[PDB]
């Protein structure tokens, strides 16, 4: 589906916060004892609405809610951390979960350069037929 923003308004800029999951640490600052408190672990930045992605993203989050809420109703985990890992596994199973039939629409194997290896090799014996 395409994303159609159907909200009353859209803030087209996203002033975000996140964590630096792999910071280039400065001396001993990586050691919990010396490092920042809970409030000082965040980095910030600003994204603008290039390609309408901010307005799309607001709408996407909105539309995600029903399926997410139904997923959370059905789980017995109190805190769910595994949604993105499960997406990654499903990405892989979609492509590599069965036998990969080359030239099929569901096999992501490209033999174009592999043709050029053997189509260059047509003349390896048909041209050299002395």
């Amino acid at each position: 589906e395409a994303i159609v923003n159907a909200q009353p308004k859209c803030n087209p800029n996203l002033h975000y916060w996140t964590t630096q999951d792999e910071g280039a640490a400065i001396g001993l600052a990586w050691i919990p004892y010396f490092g920042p408190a809970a409030e000082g672990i965040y980095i910030e930045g600003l994204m603008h609405n290039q390609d309408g992605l901010i307005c799309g993203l607001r709408q996407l989050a909105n539309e995600t809610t029903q399926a997410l809420q139904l997923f959370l109703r059905a789980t017995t985990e109190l805190r769910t951390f595994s949604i993105l890992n499960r997406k990654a596994i499903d990405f892989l199973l979609q492509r590599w979960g069965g036998t990969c039939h080359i030239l099929g629409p569901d096999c992501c194997i490209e033999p174009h350069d592999w043709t050029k290896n053997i189509t260059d090799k047509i003349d390896q014996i048909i041209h050299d037929f002395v």
Partner: protein, 263 residues
């Protein structure tokens, strides 16, 4: 299925689970992102009277929590200390490792009472309460939150401009009676004995200016009892969203003490 955002033809779309696009590339779990977006950003009313009507108490539904990795700086967050008239707590204490939303310009801190007819407080529109990288279906006691929703994305490995002046936060205190009902009443707190009767039309900037005017003009309570100021409708206040947007106030006094602030 839970939707997954992907960028094709310079545009964000939901990934189609029936189709298989072999040109889509996921070379690392780093390309997968969960993001919290604030209801604020969709133009919803953020004043305390409007905001609190979106929340309601319910029993029989176990709470649920889901993490999100990145969020949006909020103008408006909320922090609730609500009791029943008998003094017992309406909201549960924050579970271990659930801290407040990390970036709030204004924290609307509401204390007071209501009937609280249900074990947990939920969002009536199905949104989440966003805390520090954990989104919950319910409100925890004394813990700052933003109202929001979560998206999941496959980022293209090329586009690096996707989640990589200081941070200042101000607490605005309110007292409430009949919380979570039709006949809810709110008071903005200037000090422990000086209050202002709250209207939906009052912005955070107006509330802070009004409080600073009351302090400097010397219109706080100079008495053991409670002083409640009122603002009749001809007073100007700041319908525009936050991202796109003195000596003239005359005070007059009418156990207790009610009063009017004119222009």
């Amino acid at each position: 299925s839970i939707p997954l955002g992907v960028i094709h033809n310079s545009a964000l779309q939901v990934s189609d689970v029936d189709k298989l696009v072999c040109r889509d590339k996921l070379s690392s779990t780093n390309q997968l992102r969960s993001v919290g977006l604030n209801l604020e950003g969709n133009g919803v009313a953020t004043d305390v009277p409007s905001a609190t009507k979106r929340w309601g108490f319910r029993s029989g539904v176990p709470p649920k929590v889901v993490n999100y990795e990145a969020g949006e700086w909020a103008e408006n967050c909320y922090n609730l200390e609500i009791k029943k008239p008998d003094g017992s707590e309406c909201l549960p204490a924050a579970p271990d490792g659930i801290r407040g939303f990390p970036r709030c310009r204004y924290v609307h801190k509401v204390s007071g009472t209501g009937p609280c007819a249900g074990d947990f407080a939920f969002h009536k529109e199905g949104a989440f309460f966003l805390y520090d990288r954990l989104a919950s279906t319910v409100i925890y006691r004394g813990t700052t939150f933003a109202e929001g929703v979560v998206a999941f994305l496959i980022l293209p490995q090329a586009k690096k401009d996707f989640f990589s002046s200081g941070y200042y936060s101000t607490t605005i205190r309110y007292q409430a009676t009949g919380f979570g009902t039709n006949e809810t009443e709110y008071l903005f707190e200037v000090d422990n004995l000086t209050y202002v009767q709250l209207e939906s039309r009052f912005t955070p900037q107006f509330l802070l200016q009004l409080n600073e005017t009351i302090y400097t003009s010397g219109k706080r309570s100079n008495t053991t009892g409670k002083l409640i100021w009122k603002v009749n409708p001809e007073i100007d206040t700041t319908e525009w969203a936050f991202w796109e947007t003195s000596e003239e106030l005359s005070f007059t006094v009418v156990x207790x003490x009610x009063x009017x602030x004119x222009x």
